[PDB]
């Protein structure tokens, strides 16, 4: 663990948290738990709350992993972001094979309601719909869009609000890093339209999986996302190829400049455990020591 907590420092600047993705497999190995306890104030389950993990067979739920994380976070005073109710990836075959609208709508609502109810009042925010947009700004043609239609989004949010009215409901996506990107403009436009129609969308999550030198672009992209009018915006799965301090400080600054940005979550603790470990994109190295970017974020805060 680093002696200085990026979480406590960002809290002092008026933000809610600086967190990280994790799960039981990480918390029970290496120095992961000690680092999270000392330096971060929020956790997102990396995989334990996904559909394949929680409902592997229709109606036969599995909460072992998710329960471990929620209990661990509560005991350790860490906020929790529930990660992902409706998504086309890590989706069991039994769901994807359904072609009937009514059958899929009930399956989707039952999945959302069951998971949100089990942890009602303990989860700060949920990524209700994940990666619903194509790169051109059109809606991604997943089983949900194809079978239920465009209304699957409003239905998912309505159901989630009813399940736990205490949770902030987010739509999460990636490649929202440049203000000029077709996807960035589309999600801002669509979220304004959905909110105008009464859809309960509290936040826009920007994954922020960056390439080296891209951090400067989020200084302009984040204010644009905040213009959709949602109560909150957040950097949800930050990592940057090469991990330069310039890119990391720019992302932190973008959040400080935007009042509605409530916090940042980095996607993992140590480099070798990253989904793209080859790029060494995280704040702690393979020996669990803080990298120059960690210290640069501390000094900036």
Swiss-Prot record:
E.C. designation(s): 3.2.1.8
Disulfide bonds: 255-261
GH10 domain location: 3-300
Enzyme active site: 131, 237
Gene3D superfamilies registered for this protein in UniProt: Glycosidases
UniProt key word Disulfide bond: yes
Keywords: Carbohydrate metabolism, Disulfide bond, Glycosidase, Hydrolase, Polysaccharide degradation, Pyrrolidone carboxylic acid, Signal, Xylan degradation
One biological process term in Gene Ontology: xylan catabolic process
Entry GO MF terms: endo-1,4-beta-xylanase activity
TM annotation in the entry: none
Catalytic activity, reaction form: Endohydrolysis of (1->4)-beta-D-xylosidic linkages in xylans
InterPro entries attached to this UniProt entry: GH10 (IPR044846), GH10_AS (IPR031158), GH10_dom (IPR001000), Glycoside_hydrolase_SF (IPR017853)
UniProt family annotation: Belongs to the glycosyl hydrolase 10 (cellulase F) family.
Name this protein carries in UniProt: Endo-1,4-beta-xylanase
Organism this protein belongs to: Thermoascus aurantiacus
Gene this chain is encoded by: XYNA
